[PDB]
Enzyme design. Structure first.
Site, PDB file in Angstrom:
ATOM      1  N   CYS A 243      -2.435  10.291  -6.283  1.00  0.00           N
ATOM      2  CA  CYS A 243      -3.696  10.079  -5.746  1.00  0.00           C
ATOM      3  C   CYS A 243      -4.805  10.899  -6.071  1.00  0.00           C
ATOM      4  CB  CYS A 243      -3.173   9.507  -4.247  1.00  0.00           C
ATOM      5  SG  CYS A 243      -4.124   9.187  -2.971  1.00  0.00           S
TER       6      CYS A 243
ATOM      7  N   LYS B 177       0.706  -0.928   0.344  1.00  0.00           N
ATOM      8  CA  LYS B 177       0.157   0.055  -0.253  1.00  0.00           C
ATOM      9  C   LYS B 177       1.456   1.189  -0.254  1.00  0.00           C
ATOM     10  CE  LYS B 177      -3.923   2.854   0.699  1.00  0.00           C
ATOM     11  NZ  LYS B 177      -4.857   2.709  -0.744  1.00  0.00           N
TER      12      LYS B 177
HETATM   13  C1  LIG Z   1      -9.291   0.012  -3.243  1.00  0.00           C
HETATM   14  C2  LIG Z   1      -8.408   1.427  -3.457  1.00  0.00           C
HETATM   15  C3  LIG Z   1      -7.347   1.577  -3.285  1.00  0.00           C
HETATM   16  C4  LIG Z   1      -6.203   2.108  -3.900  1.00  0.00           C
HETATM   17  N1  LIG Z   1      -4.986   2.417  -3.361  1.00  0.00           N
HETATM   18  C5  LIG Z   1      -4.217   2.924  -4.345  1.00  0.00           C
HETATM   19  C6  LIG Z   1      -2.925   3.341  -3.807  1.00  0.00           C
HETATM   20  O1  LIG Z   1      -2.415   3.238  -2.278  1.00  0.00           O
HETATM   21  N2  LIG Z   1      -2.050   3.514  -3.933  1.00  0.00           N
HETATM   22  C7  LIG Z   1      -1.572   3.942  -5.470  1.00  0.00           C
HETATM   23  O2  LIG Z   1      -1.156   4.006  -6.701  1.00  0.00           O
HETATM   24  N3  LIG Z   1      -2.908   2.840  -5.989  1.00  0.00           N
HETATM   25  C8  LIG Z   1      -3.792   2.325  -6.062  1.00  0.00           C
HETATM   26  N4  LIG Z   1      -5.207   2.555  -5.919  1.00  0.00           N
HETATM   27  C9  LIG Z   1      -5.361   2.674  -8.360  1.00  0.00           C
HETATM   28  C10 LIG Z   1      -5.246   0.911  -8.287  1.00  0.00           C
HETATM   29  O3  LIG Z   1      -3.707   0.779  -7.878  1.00  0.00           O
HETATM   30  C11 LIG Z   1      -5.177   0.900 -10.122  1.00  0.00           C
HETATM   31  O4  LIG Z   1      -4.087   1.737 -10.246  1.00  0.00           O
HETATM   32  C12 LIG Z   1      -6.403   1.105 -10.131  1.00  0.00           C
HETATM   33  O5  LIG Z   1      -7.391   0.778  -9.619  1.00  0.00           O
HETATM   34  C13 LIG Z   1      -7.182   0.476 -11.657  1.00  0.00           C
HETATM   35  O6  LIG Z   1      -6.676  -0.711 -11.935  1.00  0.00           O
HETATM   36  P1  LIG Z   1      -7.766  -1.930 -12.068  1.00  0.00           P
HETATM   37  O7  LIG Z   1      -8.488  -1.108 -12.875  1.00  0.00           O
HETATM   38  O8  LIG Z   1      -7.329  -2.772 -11.861  1.00  0.00           O
HETATM   39  O9  LIG Z   1      -8.942  -1.326 -10.451  1.00  0.00           O
HETATM   40  C14 LIG Z   1      -5.876   1.562  -5.366  1.00  0.00           C
HETATM   41  C15 LIG Z   1      -7.708   1.448  -5.898  1.00  0.00           C
HETATM   42  C16 LIG Z   1      -8.345   0.547  -5.557  1.00  0.00           C
HETATM   43  C17 LIG Z   1      -9.526  -0.134  -5.703  1.00  0.00           C
END
Ligand SMILES: Cc1cc2nc3c(=O)[nH]c(=O)nc-3n(C[C@H](O)[C@H](O)[C@H](O)COP(=O)(O)O)c2cc1C
Ligand SMILES: Cc1cc2nc3c(=O)[nH]c(=O)nc-3n(C[C@H](O)[C@H](O)[C@H](O)COP(=O)(O)O)c2cc1C
Ligand SMILES: [Mg+2]
Ligand SMILES: [Mg+2]
Lengths: 311, 311
Positions: A130, A43
């Site tokens: 973020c 995270k």
């Molecule tokens: C629950 C939640 C928390 C997330 N927290 C972060 C974060 O801690 N730092 C980060 O770089 N990306 C974070 N992401 C973004 C994801 O890393 C990713 O870039 C985004 O979900 C798109 O990928 P996906 O389509 O497979 O969900 C988070 C996404 C979600 C679902």
């Protein structure tokens, strides 16, 4: 079949969790170590512990997810101490990745100093995108501040460094950013973070479905694959080959994984679908990619990596 | 039930085609007149006729569409002459809308002068957001140029004017754009244009599905509704009430239409779903909205216009 080389290290397969998903605690991380994920990432952390935003702040949708987590994490010192104890053990193929998302430039600089000074020999991901912290504009949408930050970082930070980027939607934005990123000894770019500040609505209750920021949250899943693919491809054809790419966005099946790889992604991160399914996803999606490879008579990722045909 | 007041005019219902869809020829336009659409808008025009981009340039997708049309149109003089003959007839409730998307600022100014000097008594939409022309960025992502253009437009243009905007993804972009737009006697904002420069891939042929721009095209349909809602809502709580809103993006059912009106959209445009279904859509979606309103005991759109609940 999926053996991959990335930032001069060797992984059994390109799949990883996306930062924020299944990686908040030690125990989450060990579940990822035990999974078939080829690698994994912490995270994003800040200097201090954060509770994050009020609930509800994440919701499953038919076509992906919406969240405004608010950067809940257990603090920098906690992730650093976990990853230090875990590289001493030599209990996995290839290093751990370590995300930081400082609330200011100065906070990121101070965490990057702590990582440099420490014995950490794995990979750092500086998150510039973020979108869920009230009052902080995604830094990677401010091209002057992004440059000024990275010049400062590269006067001291010698260890392997990537940047987590928000999606761009304008071809000229890709050119401006590539010209900034290409002047540095960056290890990688991770495209993409969530489609920022979308809205989902419950039509019976006539309301938003998350509490923070009046229901506005980052969008992930199938919704965003077209943007994610585009972002991976567009950086692939503009970045100097020293800087490799992690593909993130809308990965759920082997076909999704295959499409990111064809665009030029080397590693792949799974967010939304991992949140829904759990770490068992990695075994499923590995076998899907493999079967696609076997049908096409491919025995290695290099057979199609980056080979998306234009018409 | 759907009777609506917009730009001091009266429409039977808020539904329209989105520009670019089913509005290229006089025959297209007349089929929209014949439909239940409460209003309708012409294809964005440029000063000269344009063939557009090479085919294939439009593809239907499970979750929406991708296109890179390249502003094919029959020329400004052709649309103007059509709308001029059509307001003489008095054969519809409420005026027609007229979209221009000049390839330069100077070309937009020249068309806007032609509209001012003509007898046109309907509505104009300046498209600041066309993502599918090679070498021409979305102008409404360049805040200085957008301001500079509008200040020039408003020294002479006194007739009803709205702007068709690309999607924004950062709350600060919303504030910077609302401060620009609120200094002018603008009639409306239309959010949103396509999600710009996404990519779709056929995994069997390992190729993009459109020929222009290496496969990169504007995304519409279900993919984009979270972004479109967010943008409608975000301008709704920032724009001075003189400036109303057309909601465009991902509208296919009554429920989608309901969500946009709840965010604060007054008219509604349908692109992708009209392309797929044809003008019979308007009848279908009018009846869906009406049944949603009857279930809830709503008799008029002012019962929930703009009334999205936060948690
Ligand atoms: C629950 C939640 C928390 C997330 N927290 C972060 C974060 O801690 N730092 C980060 O770089 N990306 C974070 N992401 C973004 C994801 O890393 C990713 O870039 C985004 O979900 C798109 O990928 P996906 O389509 O497979 O969900 C988070 C996404 C979600 C679902
Ligand atoms: C075929 C195609 C051509 C388009 N041409 C224009 C254009 O002429 N001017 C404009 O403002 N929008 C144009 N649009 C964008 C639509 O007006 C609309 O913003 C977009 O399709 C989002 O709505 P949708 O989700 O219902 O498709 C076009 C869209 C498509 C599908
Ligand atoms: Mg393992
Ligand atoms: Mg009619």
């Amino acid at each position: 079949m999926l053996n991959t080389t990335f930032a001069n290290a060797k992984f059994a397969n390109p799949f990883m969790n996306a930062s924020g998903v299944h990686c908040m605690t030690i125990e989450d991380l060990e579940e990822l170590k035990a999974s078939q994920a080829g690698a994994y990432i912490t995270k994003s952390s800040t200097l201090e512990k954060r509770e994050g935003n009020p609930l509800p702040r994440y919701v499953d949708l038919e076509l992906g997810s919406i969240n405004s987590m608010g950067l809940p994490n257990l603090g920098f010192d906690y992730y650093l101490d976990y990853v230090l104890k875990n590289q001493k053990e030599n209990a996995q193929e290839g290093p751990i990745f370590f995300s930081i998302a400082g609330m200011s430039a100065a906070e990121n600089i101070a965490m990057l100093k702590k990582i440099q000074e420490s014995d950490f020999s794995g990979i750092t991901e500086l998150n510039l995108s973020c979108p869920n912290v009230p009052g902080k504009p995604q830094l990677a949408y401010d091209f002057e501040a992004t440059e000024k930050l990275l010049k400062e970082v590269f006067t001291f930070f010698t260890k392997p460094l990537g940047v987590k980027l928000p999606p761009y939607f304008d071809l000229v934005h890709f050119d401006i950013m590539a010209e900034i990123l290409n002047q540095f000894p960056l290890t990688y770019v991770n495209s993409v973070n969530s489609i920022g500040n979308g809205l989902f609505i419950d039509p019976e209750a006539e309301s938003v479905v998350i509490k923070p920021k009046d229901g506005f949250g980052g969008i992930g899943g199938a919704y965003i694959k077209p943007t994610a693919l585009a972002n991976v491809r567009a950086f692939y054809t503009r970045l100097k080959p020293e800087i490799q790419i992690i593909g993130t966005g809308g990965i759920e099946t082997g076909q999704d994984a295959f499409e990111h790889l064809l665009c030029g992604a080397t590693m792949l991160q799974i967010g939304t679908a991992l949140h829904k399914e759990g770490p068992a996803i990695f075994d499923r999606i590995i076998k899907e990619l493999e079967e696609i490879m076997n049908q096409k008579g491919y025995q290695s990722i290099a057979d199609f990596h980056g080979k998306l045909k234009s018409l």
